[PDB]
A = this chain, B = another copy of it.
Amino acid sequence: FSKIKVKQPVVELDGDEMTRIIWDKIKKKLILPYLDVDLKYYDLSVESRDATSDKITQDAAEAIKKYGVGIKCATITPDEARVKEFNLHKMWKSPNGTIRNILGGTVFREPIVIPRIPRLVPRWEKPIIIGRHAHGDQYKATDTLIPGPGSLELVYKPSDPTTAQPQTLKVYDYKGSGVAMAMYNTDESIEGFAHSSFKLAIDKKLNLFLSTKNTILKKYDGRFKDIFQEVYEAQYKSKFEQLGIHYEHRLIDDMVAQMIKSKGGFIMALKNYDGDVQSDIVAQGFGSLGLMTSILVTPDGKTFESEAAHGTVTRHYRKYQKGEETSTNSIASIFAWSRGLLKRGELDNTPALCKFANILESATLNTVQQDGIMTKDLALACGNNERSAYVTTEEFLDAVEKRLQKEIKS
């Protein structure tokens, strides 16, 4: 009978397939009925991006930068096949790469633990956080094929040939056809990455591990290991020793293994690509991709981009296309909204907003924890192949709706 007035505007980026269905239903029954928010809509569906020539993604990202908070829905990243499917103009770049490259920062990811649910990696009991660097490397590289024999070279030409000097490093000499590419990153980005990773370790009282491959990419990865170590000793080694938490660099090999056999409970900082890949493993490993939150934070600490860790769940969308029933977990999507709404509230000092968010969350999880109403993904975790063990994609969302309404009378 009353609505919470949200101060500043929230930027919303709509997506594709299964996740677009879930999204809408979420803001219809779970968000709009309770909030007086000014949503600045941006449709990032393939058809929208195509028609707009990906320009909209530029606009969306710059909207987020402006207003501070963004809630993004899963989106189809066009690969040859996709182009055929939607008869696209170009084979557009992942909008996630464009946004992330525009905003910068780290993408913090961690599973949503529902006690009632088992775990694929049983020994894991305490949440594992992934601090994926969002800025460069291969999500902003320059790949290209190489026709026939010739020389490959990476060339650098300074602006002021007085403080530095040119470089022409011979990369290879093809004797046949193949591929090549080059990527990059900056000291500025890595430093923010480090600052954001040390802060979260301190804020959550968890040990921090930076994983790299510095024994191979001696200079490249070495810059990561070194800046981290520099910043640490510079202004965290104090609060860390005082908190009982340690920072340590390890080789990615050792770390992913150390993790697979641990009880979870620590922060893993990784380069973009590793943050990307491993986050999925952690996700799937704690239960299902349906139970992992994701949020990009800028070094500022005043800009956010909330999203689910998974994709558009195409495989499930395909079933939905042919009148077949679906059991897609919407929990990450709900949290994508709640966590977005949370940062919105802290930024504007609107505790009414933050409270609602925790209620949204508390009700979403309890519908599983308490009432035992879960989708197929979580059902297979408990060990029940039986169809009568789970509910549909819409049935679940309705149960969350119902329990939310109850938990709002208190």
Binding site for B on A (CB under 8 A): 77-80, 91, 94, 97, 120-123, 138-160, 163-172, 174-190, 213-223, 252-254, 256-257, 260-261, 273-274, 276-277, 280-281, 283-285, 288-289, 311
Minimum CB–CB distance from A373 to chain B (whole Å) comes to 22
If the complex has contacts A79-B215, A144-B167, A171-B142, are A285 and B311 also in contact, measured as CB distance less than 8 A? no
* Alpha-carbon gap, A273 to B215, bound state (A): 13
Known contacts A121-B121, A152-B184, A180-B182; 9 additional CB pairs below 8 A are: A78-B215, A79-B215, A143-B217, A154-B155, A154-B182, A176-B188, A179-B220, A181-B184, A257-B289
A301–B77 Cα distance when bound, in Å, is 38
Query: What 6 pairs between A and B have smallest CB-CB spacing?
Result: A178-B186, A147-B164, A150-B158, A182-B182, A143-B220, A257-B284
On chain B, the residues within 8 Å of A183 by CB distance are 171, 180-182
Shortest beta-carbon distance, A246 to chain B, in Å? 15
Write 22 A-B pairs (CB below 8 A) sorted by A numbering. A77-B216, A79-B218, A120-B260, A138-B213, A141-B216, A144-B169, A145-B219, A149-B159, A150-B158, A152-B154, A153-B156, A154-B154, A154-B171, A154-B182, A174-B186, A177-B187, A178-B185, A178-B190, A179-B219, A180-B220, A181-B183, A257-B283
Cα–Cα distance between A122 and B381 once the two chains are bound (Å): 12
Determine if B157 and A153 form an interchain contact, defined as CB atoms under 8 angstroms apart: yes
**Copies of this chain, whole number:** 2
Q: Which residues of B contact A144 (CB under 8 A)?
A: 154, 156, 167, 169, 219-220
Q: How far is the CB of A141 from chain B (nearest CB, A)?
A: 7
Per the bound structure, the CA–CA distance linking A188 and B175 in Å amounts to 10
**A148 contact set on B, CB distance < 8 A:** 158-160, 163-164
CA distance A257 to B164 in the complex (A): 45
Main secondary structure, interface of A, reads mixed
In the assembled complex, the Cα of A253 lies from the Cα of B282 at a distance in Å of 11
Find chain B residues with CB under 8 A from A121 CB: 120-121, 260, 285
Q: How far is the CA of A311 from the CA of B213 in the complex (A)?
A: 14
Of the candidates B138, B178, B253, which one forms a contact with A217 in the assembled complex, judged by CB atoms under 8 Å apart?
A: B138
Bound-state Cα–Cα, A159 to B153, Å: 14
Chain B residues closer than 8 Å to A164, beta-carbon distance? 146-148, 150
Minimum C-beta distance from A369 to chain B (A): 21
Please name all residues of chain B whose beta carbon is closer than 8 Å to the beta carbon of A180 when the two chains form the complex.
154, 156, 182-184, 220
B residues within 8 A CB of A220? 143-144, 179-181
Q: Do A149 and B141 form a contact, CB below 8 Å, given A177-B186, A283-B257?
A: no
Separation of A122 and B121 alpha carbons in the complex (Å): 8
Residue in B closest to A143 when the chains form the complex, CB atoms: B220
* Docked complex Cα distance between A170 and B80 (Å): 23
Q: Which residues of B contact A123 (CB under 8 A)?
A: 120
A178 CA to B274 CA, complexed, in Å: 19
